[PDB]
Design a protein around this nucleic acid. Structure first.
Ligand code: TTP
Ligand code: CA
Lengths: 554, 412
DNA sequence: TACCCCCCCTTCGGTGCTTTGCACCGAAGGGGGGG
């Protein structure tokens, strides 16, 4: 054979052998386009005829190249992949256009038949054994082994990407001022050189890629804006996503909503204010992906206003390392948040949204910190620095939250922006008992078998209540006892419980909850003027905690 | 040209596969520059995706360092080489180090680059350097010498180390020297002036053996324990006595002699929390006896080298932080409280990071171990910021806990 | 009827403490996107 570039050693998982599985019954329509290019590979040394000494077999199929009449070849190596050694992918993420610095001249070029321009490992070639069908079932068809990287193997991308880097390394060191964004075979080359000199250096690199046997076809070569790169349209001073088609289906299935949600999540990177909450509420707990499901009046309104944002075209800008990074967040309600990352005002680098509901009970302050953390990691990925934050929360509001909370929490450099709705704490437990407020000793208990329980209270002023509870748990009764004391008290109340579970939930000052019982406790706490919660151990003969422990067990 | 000591993982165990987390620009530039010179000096060499193992990497600056320092997070690799640095080539711990009036920490990590590494083991030291905005795929490397921050590195070099030290260990007989990871702990009862001089003597004594030292000053005798304390009030309310009883009831899992019967008697009624309660004779005496029991040591608390150290930290607010180091629950080997640390009254994560570093340093001096931390922080909050404030060359094991302070037992 | 990577949203169940209930988290299958 011939040796284009340095090979990469590969092994199998120790004590295991190759792929022996029978081919698919492929239709003759694909076989026509299949054996066509397949026989052309043998001329270039990409594929080779093998004798029956090779006892392996793996299925083969082909799909049309998207947006092309040409056909691409794919190999089902699922069983070979199971027994092939583990790798470590060198692709750690995806470039975003909002990370690109502005360059005077830019070139984008794709490498042709790339996995086929990289030699496989000598000793491993035998395991690629597959057979090519024919028009009829009389002729057998030649069995082949790959001499290059096959499309469909689990090691093909990693080996190409690492080999690509070693090829570009000499050029990158010889041209330190050339920016080469290397993503598989797609190369973004930009420079501040004059456009005449730029194309001169481009040809040097195309030659150096050619020296190592990497084709740079002119059809895939792009010299003029707007460059199509990573699904974006790159202009000299702006960028945007390639147009986004929203399905117009009159009756929606589950796979329709799924397709819709993903398109919107993709659009949320530049189109500001995309919301997916009410559309995703339709996909919860559904069995069939093909099942038809109606659109709620909530999701109908949400999809309507989402289409209005996509109506008018928007664009992003590029990164200026001299100027600061600014990230501003707005509250959209129902645990939904959107943000814009910019440098010059009203000229966005990119947008996004944080809508994750973390935990059973939360508040807007918790969710705002989580959105700040998502943005920070995202910004460290793209620009390698943390942005300055403009947050819709008063400085005193935050100062009260993080100082009092029992867990460590923090927000990077940030300033208050008065854009409503503002984030706030909806109530505050007193640090010390309230003089003149009635003192409610609450307790609750439930029977493990009967699922029946009681929840009640006793007060210093003689007040009392006990409520029978049906199909409940020990925890729910402990919360219920506090709900009763909150309902039956004035604006200022002292509540003494023995429930660790309930006190932990309430002390975190939630304003939203999955539990409807907690929402009613939250609703009551917002109405109060002074609440003081305390904790005492059970069965210690303490206070009214012993007297109400008797009432709720009878 | 030195013989390479063979190293094998724990029986029936696979190498570390841990993804590389995003790095800031200033850290990636520092890493590429550190790794370039480390490559032309043969300390590391590039590899490919055929190596299935990976370990995270980032950079730090020591306290006032101003110079970047490479740091690899070998915690996962160290858990899989545990047979090596404990059973086989371990280092004895000097129980007298914690008794010295001054102890100094020196970064000897640059000497590990002298000794080569076993060829069969180099496949496990693989790490990947990321690129800003994924301009380039991950550039992978491998260690050819003893890596900085691997637990097997000081054990292999121990033979070489004890030889370099032997002339100085004889010239100064009663000075204690301990080696943990990339750090060398040196302590004496000499005066501050004599102490810092003998350090420089040890620096030059290491220079002629081929090592630089890019010093931290401790005082283990100064360290003070934090005990459980009961308040002093001229008048007690129902809430005061309720809080006190819950505290004493919780403290009863440590000091079994705590009694509550006479204090619970004072609560028998259903009273308003703010009502003042005069104390009875037997209650005041039960309270007096409890205050004395809390002066006593916990019965039967001792260090077991076979068990892991656990470290719990509680945020007390207004800059204060408390911690307890234990092996079995409620059998606390040490308790303490930190205040007015860097970032106090402004940054919670920085203070917590500074607390972890101080606690680990104390654990290394006292027991020669690093404890597993129960951190009162959310995972996403900690994993975002903790590298910005990390100033140590080791990284302890940690987990995250959410335990609301229903009873303020470690601080009034 | 293939491969690798990143993102969001949902399900589901392991883990450990709030305890045999409840809360949290991470893997996974759905989708979007790139080559
Ligand atoms: C698009 C695509 C690429 N790949 C792999 C195989 C490719 O060699 C490599 C890049 O694919 P492409 O760039 O789309 O095509 P190509 O590199 O073979 O050459 P040309 O553009 O002239 O047709 O990534 C897949 O495995 N499945 C896919 O759907
Ligand atoms: Ca191509």
């Amino acid at each position: 054979p011939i040796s284009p570039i340095e090979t990469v050693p590969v092994k199998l998982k120790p004590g295991m052998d190759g792929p022996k599985v029978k081919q698919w019954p492929l239709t003759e329509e694909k076989i026509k386009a299949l054996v066509e290019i397949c026989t052309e590979m043998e001329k270039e040394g990409k594929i080779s005829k093998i004798g029956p000494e090779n006892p392996y077999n793996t299925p083969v199929f082909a799909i049309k190249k998207k947006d092309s009449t040409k056909w691409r070849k794919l190999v089902d190596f699922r069983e070979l992949n199971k027994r092939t050694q583990d790798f470590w992918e060198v692709q750690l993420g995806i470039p975003h256009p909002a990370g690109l610095k502005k360059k005077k001249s830019v070139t984008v070029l794709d490498v042709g038949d790339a996995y086929f321009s990289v030699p496989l490992d000598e000793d491993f070639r035998k395991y690629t054994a597959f057979t090519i069908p024919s028009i009829n079932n009389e002729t057998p068809g030649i069995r082949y082994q790959y001499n290059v990287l096959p499309q469909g193997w689990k090691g093909s991308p990693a080996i190409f990407q690492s080999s690509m880097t070693k090829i570009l390394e000499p050029f990158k060191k010889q041209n330190p001022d050339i920016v080469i964004y290397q993503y598989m075979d797609d190369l973004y080359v930009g420079s501040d050189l004059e456009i005449g000199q730029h194309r001169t250096k481009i040809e040097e690199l195309r030659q150096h890629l050619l020296r190592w046997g990497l084709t740079t076809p002119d059809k895939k070569h792009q010299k003029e804006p707007p460059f199509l790169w990573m699904g974006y349209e790159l202009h000299p001073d702006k960028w945007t996503v390639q147009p986004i088609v929203l399905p117009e289906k009159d009756s929606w299935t589950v796979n329709d909503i799924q397709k819709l949600v993903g398109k919107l999540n993709w659009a949320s990177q530049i189109y500001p204010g995309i919301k997916v909450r009410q559309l995703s509420k339709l996909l919860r707990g559904t069995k069939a992906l093909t099942e038809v499901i109606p659109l709620t009046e909530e999701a109908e309104l949400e999809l309507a206003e989402n289409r209005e944002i996509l109506k008018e075209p928007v664009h992003g800008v590029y990164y200026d390392p001299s100027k600061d990074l600014i990230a501003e967040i707005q509250k959209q309600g129902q645990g939904q948040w959107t943000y814009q990352i910019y440098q010059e005002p009203f000229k966005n680098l990119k947008t996004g949204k944080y809508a994750r509901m973390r935990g059973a009970h939360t508040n807007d302050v918790k969710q705002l910190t989580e959105a700040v953390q998502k943005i920070t990691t995202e910004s460290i990925v793209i620009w390698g620095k943390t942005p300055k934050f403009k947050l819709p929360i008063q400085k005193e509001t935050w100062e009260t939250w993080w100082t009092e909370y029992w867990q460590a929490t923090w927000i990077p450099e940030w300033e208050f922006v008065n854009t409503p709705p503002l984030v706030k704490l909806w109530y505050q437990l007193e640090k010390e008992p309230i003089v003149g407020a009635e003192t409610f000793y609450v307790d609750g208990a439930a029977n493990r078998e009967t699922k029946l329980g009681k929840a009640g209270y006793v007060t210093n002023k003689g007040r009392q209540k006990v409520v029978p509870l049906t199909n409940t748990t020990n925890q729910k009764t402990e919360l219920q006892a506090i709900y009763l004391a909150l309902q039956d008290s004035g604006l200022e109340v002292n509540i003494v419980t023995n429930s660790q579970y309930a006190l932990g939930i309430i002390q975190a000052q939630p304003d939203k909850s999955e539990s409807e019982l907690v929402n009613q406790i939250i609703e009551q706490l917002i109405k109060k003027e002074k609440v003081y919660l305390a904790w005492v151990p059970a069965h210690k003969g303490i206070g009214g905690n012993e007297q109400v422990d008797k009432l709720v067990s009878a | 040209p030195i013989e390479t000591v063979p190293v094998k993982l724990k029986p029936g165990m696979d190498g570390p596969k841990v993804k590389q987390w995003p790095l800031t620009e200033e850290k990636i530039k520092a890493l590429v520059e550190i790794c370039t010179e480390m490559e032309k000096e043969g300390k590391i060499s590039k590899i490919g995706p055929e190596n299935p193992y990976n370990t995270p990497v980032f950079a730090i600056k020591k306290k006032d360092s101003t110079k970047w320092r490479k740091l690899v997070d070998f915690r996962e690799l160290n858990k899989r080489t545990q047979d090596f640095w404990e059973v086989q080539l371990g280092i004895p711990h000097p129980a007298g180090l914690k008794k010295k009036k001054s102890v100094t920490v020196l970064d000897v990590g640059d000497a590990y680059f002298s000794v080569p590494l076993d060829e069969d083991f180099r496949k496990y030291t693989a790490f990947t350097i990321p690129s800003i905005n994924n301009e380039t795929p991950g550039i992978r490397y491998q260690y050819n010498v003893l890596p900085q921050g691997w637990k097997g590195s000081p054990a292999i070099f121990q033979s070489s180390m004890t030889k370099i030290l032997e002339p100085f260990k004889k010239q100064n007989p009663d000075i204690v020297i301990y080696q943990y990871m990339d750090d060398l702990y040196v302590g004496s009862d000499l005066e501050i002036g004599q102490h810092r001089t003998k350090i420089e003597e040890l620096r030059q004594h290491l220079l002629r053996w081929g090592l630089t030292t890019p010093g931290y000053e401790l005082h283990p005798d100064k360290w003070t324990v934090q005990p459980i304390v009961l308040p002093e009030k001229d008048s007690w309310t129902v809430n005061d006595i309720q809080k006190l009883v819950g505290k004493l009831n919780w403290a009863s899992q440590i000091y079994p002699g705590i009694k509550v019967r006479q204090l619970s008697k004072l609560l028998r009624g259903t009273k308003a929390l703010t009502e003042v309660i005069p104390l009875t004779e037997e209650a005041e005496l039960e309270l007096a006896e409890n205050r004395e029991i809390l002066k006593e040591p916990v019965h039967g608390v001792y260090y077991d080298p076979s068990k892991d150290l656990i470290a719990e930290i509680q945020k007390q607010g207004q800059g204060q932080w408390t911690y307890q180091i234990y092996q079995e629950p409620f059998k606390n080997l040490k308790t303490g409280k930190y205040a007015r640390m860097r970032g106090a009254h402004t940054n919670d994560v920085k203070q917590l990071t500074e607390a972890v570093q101080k606690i680990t340093t104390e654990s290394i001096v006292i027991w020669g171990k690093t404890p597993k931390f129960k951190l009162p922080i959310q995972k996403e909050t900690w994993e975002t910021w903790w590298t910005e404030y990390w100033q140590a060359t080791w990284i302890p094991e940690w987990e995250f806990v959410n335990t609301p302070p229903l009873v303020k037992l470690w601080y009034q």
